[PDB]
């Protein structure tokens, strides 16, 4: 299988219809499809588990997981501004004066209808774990505005998906400051080498950490000054290294050799079955430094 | 039209070719774009744009020339993909066979299918020569690029022997002084930005912005022993930039005096104001060179 590299997590506001033999059904009618020539960009649930699987849910111990399939045009924004001069300077080319706002609305889609077709696609694919016993889903992905287009990819397969963001008690840059500021993370976890630092005022100084001695005094300075602690990187147990960001989102997931390679003694042959042990190792894991996390944040807002 | 980052480099030799000479070696190598089929093209252009058809612009021994490049916005995934689809659909009756020279001319039908399709890329990039000082000025934040447009013009010339300018002292240490001693050399005052990296192999990087850098956050990392490697500076209350250890200046802003000082009575006629301008631009540069080599030591052996 392939691991998470980021974590946006929300709440599902006190359970969903999770019938999954209804929900496998439900999410077959947004099966991916790819995109027709004047089509920008298509998105549609694929098999977790790929060419090895048909099923659009993997499921094992109240863990499911799923897979959004995205395709974009390769179209670039100077494609398209040169393909419009092009032609607006041709009718110029015999009497200027161009205008006028509805007049290349009607211009710039013919050369959209003419480039469209040509244009090569990108693909993107976010996994999508959702934890039965907690209340909460996970989504393996960098930015807010990804997890919000799976989300409501998945809301409209299933009509209503009630989810939050966590939010906590106490702000995260002032917890993470005083884990830098004390020299010490929340029990659980340890400080790395990594870190953002801002100035309480836009304008005021940002300081990006690397490689660097946090319980040091060079950057104690810095809090002591207003400065406040963004992103921290953290190791949970020897196990799981992180950025924590004040947003409260995980980036840059590294799971330890002894996790990866736990299950390769299977036979490097039956992959439903290696999906099956590191899919199970990998949730209870990731859920179980999400449930310390909050702890170590100071708790929920309630 | 002006400058937004700066590689600079000594030119061995006096160049000795004549500009109408030069202006028709250049014409030779002269951009002409990509086929349906090519990839890639690179040649010279009007400096000036469409208001002229010369490929060279000279004032006061300042030559200004300018390469563009187009390559092909063709990804190796989409090339992959249609080579493998095409290769399991000759997994109709097998024969395996040839995966040497059958994929091989596959391949370049793969292409001579998309090559066609693919839209273009565009980049131009002034080179600025200093014939009284012997420095070329290429407009450009990487070394790849500077080195790609120099060999255009070695190309069209025979031979150019360039070398980068190469301090007598390493400019780090220069750089950290300025920053300890709270103070950069005459011409030139400390903004707002820095790169701060420690000198054992394994050891922090801090970059700041917006940040106060005579103070004791900043120079506690130096007494800490990191070198400054970049730092924001501003020539005159005239030109910012960052200067790099490397050796070369990014993100160029010319303070708003300069970018209007032939504002007036220039209109339709944009030849007048690129003259006005280039001169302009070229002597003032000009001098932030010679200040900042002095500034910083000084060169050479
Ligand atoms: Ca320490
Ligand atoms: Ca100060």
Not at 195 to 211: F, Q, T
Request: glycine letters at 6%; hydrophobic letters at 40%; a negative charge.
């Amino acid at each position: 299988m392939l691991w998470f590299k980021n974590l946006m997590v929300y709440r599902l506001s006190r359970e969903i219809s999770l019938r999954a033999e209804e929900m496998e059904k439900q999410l077959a009618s947004m099966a991916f499809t790819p995109c027709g020539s004047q089509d920008m960009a298509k998105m549609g649930w694929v098999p977790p588990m790929g060419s090895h699987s048909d099923a659009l849910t993997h499921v094992a111990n109240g863990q499911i997981v799923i897979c959004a399939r995205k395709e974009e045009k390769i179209l670039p924004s100077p494609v398209i501004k040169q393909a419009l001069e092009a032609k607006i300077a041709k009718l110029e080319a015999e009497q200027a004066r161009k205008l006028k706002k509805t007049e290349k609305d009607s211009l710039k889609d013919e050369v959209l209808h003419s480039l469209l077709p040509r244009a090569f696609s990108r693909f993107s694919q976010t996994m999508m774990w959702i934890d039965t016993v907690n209340g909460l889903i996970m989504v393996d992905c960098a930015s807010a505005k990804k997890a919000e287009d799976t989300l409501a990819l998945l809301r409209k397969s299933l009509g209503s998906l009630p989810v939050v963001p966590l939010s906590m008690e106490n702000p995260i840059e002032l917890t993470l400051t005083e884990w830098v500021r004390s020299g010490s993370a929340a029990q659980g976890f340890q400080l790395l080498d990594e870190a953002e630092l801002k100035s309480l005022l836009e304008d005021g100084g940002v300081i990006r950490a690397k490689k660097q001695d946090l319980t040091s005094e060079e950057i104690t300075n810095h809090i002591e000054a207003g400065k406040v602690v963004t992103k921290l990187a953290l190791d949970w147990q020897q196990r799981i290294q992180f950025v924590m960001c004040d947003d409260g989102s995980l980036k840059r997931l590294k799971f330890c050799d002894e996790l990866r390679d736990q299950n390769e003694d299977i036979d490097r042959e039956d992959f439903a079955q290696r999906f099956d042990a590191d899919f199970i190792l990998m949730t209870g894991e990731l859920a179980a430094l999400i449930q310390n996390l909050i702890e170590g944040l100071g708790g929920e807002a309630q």
